[PDB]
Symmetry: C5
């Protein structure tokens, strides 16, 4: 598996606009909401769950990176795998998107798979 798999979706020139931390089924988790830096379009919501999905090993690193980018408000590319979370109220509140990557973005390109 890889962040950059073409079966994963990504969204460039985004800003992390919201951050949530909580717990589900004995596992800490977090979610982020991202929006286009220019405000156009629909927000992306994605979550990471410490002990769930093939992406569990990256939980700490993505949490830290989300916090960092959230603190700077800089443009990023967000990478997700769709249809991963399955608890219905959790998906309703957030989404089924698993967060699988974050890339810094310049004016012209983003530093990550495309």
């Amino acid at each position: 598996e890889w962040t950059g798999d073409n079966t994963n979706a990504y969204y460039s020139d985004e800003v992390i606009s919201e951050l949530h931390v909580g717990q589900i089924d004995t596992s800490p988790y977090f979610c982020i909401k991202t929006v286009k830096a220019n405000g156009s379009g629909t927000p992306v919501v994605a979550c990471a769950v410490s002990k769930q999905s093939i992406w569990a090993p990256s939980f700490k690193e993505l949490l830290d990176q989300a916090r960092y980018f959230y603190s700077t408000g800089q443009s990023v590319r967000i990478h997700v795998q769709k249809n991963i979370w399955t608890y219905p109220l959790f998906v309703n509140t957030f989404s089924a998107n698993a967060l699988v990557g974050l890339s810094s973005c310049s004016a012209t390109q983003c530093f990550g798979p495309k």
Copy 2:
């Protein structure tokens, strides 16, 4: 269990106004106090205690997050489960509320579960 279970209480548009760190019964713990950003209502107090309650696994992540939201002073939704801490002096000083989640807020919403 889940932060967003409807058996948990939550309070929107709060600012973390105080922070305490200590130890009880072999466990490091932290407590926070929050007040409505607009001045209304009653302060909320909640604590997380390492290795204690069903919420133990999120202690570290919640501590870090509390420290962050505290440092920025931004508006948040605080999620608690009531009547969890039972040590009477501790409860009297702080509360029985376990801290089970923290959500950033916008002008119209907070990014987390609600009823």
Copy 3:
């Protein structure tokens, strides 16, 4: 045991003014010095030692929190247990106080046991 036990001692309206990190007997440790925000009184010194005393489990969290308040320079209440550390040169250099808690203080009250 609890930070708020009345057999512990606390001091309000203080600022963490100094910070030291080292090692003793295979254990990392840190110490802090606090002084009254208003310049009155006598400094408080306390240490925490990674694998020593009943307070060992809180070492990391106390260190992080000491660092936090030290960086903000805000008014705090420091909670100690007296006469814990016993290595004479160590005590001479710092004190026998074990650091057992830290509370933020507003102008008229502190958020912690009293």
Copy 4:
């Protein structure tokens, strides 16, 4: 093995211009892009991958240090070992360079093996 082995390569007076965090084959990883402080030259890309390659033990420290240097934008020397990552799409997106060290380049020169 050592960061300073002459079989490794390094580049001085660089600035970390981009940062990416992801996961590949069960491992969180990060990549950085660096460019000359004065704008010349060709970018340098390097990655560190958790629990992969002989440089795995330093993953956390290198991640933290990359973040630090990325946040300040200060001049640095980046140390790599070439031809370590083999996953082809990953290499095409980033590079095969393992990140093996980071040095500040402040006053006299770069503070690290040369």
Copy 5:
């Protein structure tokens, strides 16, 4: 053993001017260079190696503290134990000094053993 043993050396009113992070023999390490706040005398170079020396258990705490002091630029007392590291290229690049402690300094005295 202790940071404050009289068989250790220390240097007061030093500013951390350089920072390096890398790996040697499967072990992360960092090194710092410090100079007198008034720019007199000779720089001090000291390293900490995870998994090596008796000071190994304090590695993370020292790295963290070095980073902090390095970012503030404040004057500190550096505690070292001499003649510890043995790999000649390493010693030649850096020094044989093991970092054993870091103390904040007021205008008149440092908060550490002397």
